[PDB]
Amino acid sequence: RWRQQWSGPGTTKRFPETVLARCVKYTEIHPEMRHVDCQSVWDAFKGAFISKHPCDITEEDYQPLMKLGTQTVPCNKILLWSRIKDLAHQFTQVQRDMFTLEDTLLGYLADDLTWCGEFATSKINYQSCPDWRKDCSNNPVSVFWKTVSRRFAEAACDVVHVMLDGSRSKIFDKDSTFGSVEVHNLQPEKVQTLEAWVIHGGREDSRDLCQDPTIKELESIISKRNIQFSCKNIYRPDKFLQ
């Protein structure tokens, strides 16, 4: 017909199968979400982006999926992260009472996947999906992750932790979901402290990264939002205390 070709990779192959299997396994190992009808949430997920131009997806498109995947997690044991998902998921795996976004149903469903649809048809596009900088920044994956990260940050309370990679050029990057969505959606009425865990890395060059200019910038941001800021250098990543 008039198919749109994009500069980014297509939908992950076996995407419906993978999403349904992930939902099954999650409801298995997370009994607090056993009330979930997985076929219905997959229907909501696919209805979010099917038969819609991939560059005009909005948060409301994902609203039905957000309701079937509502998950009130203990708000005082939320672990945010940025650019160190390996170590963050290791921590939540060895200290199984704390949650990352990927430990919730929707994050576990969509983690490491790619998906988009077509405007003229109702089939999932497996050939290409929009590139964020070359095609369009608001696509099914972008809108989904922004929406879910906003709702996950808004649900946090008491002391909220964030894991950060100290080996990055920008330990705190404004152009990340944590910097562009999560820090701005922590509720001052529920959160009193954001605690950064700056994980150390780089064979040599291990000083006090809590004095890094990006950490001071994050501190001023969270302070202007009337939330206390906490920062702790982590020199070697011993989850073997845990």
Swiss-Prot record:
GO biological process: apoptotic signaling pathway; artery smooth muscle contraction; B cell proliferation; B cell receptor signaling pathway; female pregnancy; long-term synaptic depression; NAD metabolic process; negative regulation of apoptotic process
Domain of life: Eukaryota
Stretches in topological domain Extracellular: 1-242
Tissue expression summary: Expressed at high levels in pancreas, liver, kidney, brain, testis, ovary, placenta, malignant lymphoma and neuroblastoma.
Residues listed as glycosylation sites in the UniProt record: D56, A120, D165, D175
Keyword Disulfide bond in record: yes
Catalytic reactions on record: 2'-phospho-cyclic ADP-ribose + nicotinate = nicotinate-adenine dinucleotide phosphate; NAD(+) = cyclic ADP-beta-D-ribose + nicotinamide + H(+); NAD(+) + H2O = ADP-D-ribose + nicotinamide + H(+); cyclic ADP-beta-D-ribose + H2O = ADP-D-ribose
Primary site of residence: other
Activity control mechanisms: ATP inhibits the cADPR hydrolyzing activity.
pH dependence comment: Optimum pH for NAADP(+) production is 5.0 from either substrate, activity is much higher at pH 5.0 than 7.4.
GO molecular-function term, one example from the UniProt record: transferase activity
E.C. numbers: 3.2.2.-, 3.2.2.6, 2.4.99.20
Active site: C75, C157
Annotated localization: Cell surface; Membrane
Subunit structure: Homodimer.
Family membership: Belongs to the ADP-ribosyl cyclase family.
Additional comment: A cell surface antigen recognized in lymophocytes by multiple mAbs.
Protein name: ADP-ribosyl cyclase/cyclic ADP-ribose hydrolase 1
Residue span relative to the full protein: 45 to 286 of 300
